[PDB]
Ligand binder design. Structure first.
Ligand SMILES: Cc1n/c(=N/[C@@H]2CCC[C@H]2CO)s[nH]1
Ligand SMILES: [Zn+2]
Ligand SMILES: [Zn+2]
Ligand SMILES: [Zn+2]
Length: 459
């Protein structure tokens, strides 16, 4: 039970308006054959074009919703829609393109998937709400065979060229015309009552239906992401490193210790209510403060209602001391809070678009995060950048230029001039901070927070 068997049954009901008379009894084997593909009994790493739901989830970075609308059938033109927003009209002779024959349409398909996926995945997974034309049109831009490697590198082959009879990964596909060994999954195989728009609209208001194929491709993938990452949560599934994952997470841990440590020095809160991940550790283990923990798993549907986290009768007096919501998404934060809230709008290779305004943040694990809402922070202010250090001014051990900054809160800066050690740490902390901000995180703090109260901790 690692791969999807070709002898598995395929429910064909959703395919009988474009394919009238299609048999009720159908396996993937007969379906791939009907699509115009010969599998030849190949034990070379590609057992089925279609994949399991578990395999689709392990490869979410590769998802591209795909839908074809019969615009007028190898007589009528076909509008090919993709969840990237692209609409290509192929003739059999929001980005809507005019009718062009398959030989040029296929070149555009390879460019679009290559530029979209080269930094995300080693493959493409076509997410469908299959009715007929998308499966039958796959023979016009897809070639299948044994698993292969790139002609220019050691990555897996995702594209083929008829002009040169060579294979390439997403990075080296310039000029390639065919999609090689793609994967696909039909959402309509998961047991849905009603059409695509009806099932999608139950959970999302962001994606409308402007009746173009790309609208259905977007709603398809959005619904597939809700089923796999909103209503079903699997935090065990590990995901390959494709970017700045380790630096972003190290930066987040440094910023948390910094922001919280300074807050406890500046306003000397007797108690700290730490609301969030049930596996949390005290980020400032030397602080005098009464550290109280409360468990709240990363919500993936709607942000927590502050009235349910705190009320119905815990320390109970959350109003006493300070509240820390580190990556804990609530609808309206209290005034006495330190908050790290991820911005689902951020454009990055880690953050994939999600359902109902949310985003799927993929960094080691997959976390669907609810839509950003500036109203959550009405009782708070944006946390300003600062670097605080009580460590001794001692070098031990990178050519220097004197650091001069009003945001370097150290004994040396108070006393007149920043020492080398603290200037190395400042520039390092500023990089880790900038790294965290770029990854999409936001930092918010109680309105009375003032970095001025930190200079007095050097009496
Ligand atoms: C218009 C739009 N942009 C999107 N970008 C996705 C990011 C991962 C590849 C793309 C797969 O759809 S989704 N909707
Ligand atoms: Zn390559
Ligand atoms: Zn949606
Ligand atoms: Zn110093």
């Amino acid at each position: 039970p690692t791969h999807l068997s070709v002898d598995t049954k395929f429910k064909t009901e959703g395919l009988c308006v474009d394919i009238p008379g299609i048999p009720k009894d159908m396996t993937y084997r007969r379906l791939i054959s009907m699509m115009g593909f010969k599998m030849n009994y190949q034990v070379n790493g590609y057992p089925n074009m279609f994949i399991t739901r578990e395999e689709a989830i392990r490869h979410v970075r590769a998802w591209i919703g795909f839908d074809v609308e019969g615009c007028h059938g190898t007589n009528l033109p076909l509008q090919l829609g993709f969840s990237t927003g692209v609409n290509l009209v192929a003739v059999p002779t929001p980005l809507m393109y005019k009718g062009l024959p398959w030989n040029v349409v296929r070149i555009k398909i390879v460019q679009m998937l290559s530029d979209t996926l080269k930094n995300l995945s080693d493959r493409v997974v076509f997410v469908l709400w299959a009715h007929g034309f998308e499966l039958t049109s796959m023979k016009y831009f897809v070639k299948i065979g044994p698993e292969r490697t790139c002609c220019l590198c050691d990555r897996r082959a995702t594209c083929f060229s008829t002009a040169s009879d060579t294979y390439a990964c997403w990075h080296h596909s310039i000029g390639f015309d065919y999609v090689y060994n793609p994967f696909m999954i039909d959402v309509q195989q998961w047991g849905f009552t009603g059409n695509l728009q009806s099932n999608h609209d139950l959970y999302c208001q962001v994606h409308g239906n402007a009746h173009v194929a790309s609208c259905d491709a977007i709603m398809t993938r959005c619904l597939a992401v809700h089923e796999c990452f909103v209503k079903r949560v699997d935090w065990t599934i590990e995901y390959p490193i494709i970017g700045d994952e380790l630096k972003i997470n190290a930066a987040c841990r440094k910023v948390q210790h910094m922001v919280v440590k300074a807050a406890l020095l500046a306003d000397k809160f007797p108690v700290l209510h730490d609301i969030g991940n049930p596996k949390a550790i005290k980020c400032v283990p030397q602080a005098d403060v009464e550290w109280k923990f409360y468990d709240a798993q990363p919500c993936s549907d709607k942000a927590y209602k502050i009235e349910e986290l705190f009320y119905s009768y815990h320390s109970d007096k959350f109003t006493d001391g300070v509240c820390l919501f580190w990556n804990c998404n609530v609808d309206r934060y209290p005034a006495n809070s330190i908050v790290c809230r991820f911005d689902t709008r951020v454009l990055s290779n880690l953050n994939l678009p999600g359902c109902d305004g949310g985003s799927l943040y993929v960094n080691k694990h997959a976390f669907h995060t609810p839509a950003f809402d500036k109203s959550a922070f009405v009782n708070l202010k944006q946390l300003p950048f600062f670097y605080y250090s009580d460590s001794p001014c001692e070098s031990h051990g990178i050519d220097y230029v004197p650091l001069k900054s009003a945001t370097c809160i150290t004994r040396c800066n108070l006393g007149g001039a920043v020492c080398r050690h603290h200037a190395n740490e400042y520039r390092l902390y500023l990089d880790a901070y900038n790294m965290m901000i770029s990854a999409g995180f936001s930092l918010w703090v109680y309105k009375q927070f003032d970095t001025y109260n930190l200079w007095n901790t050097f009496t």
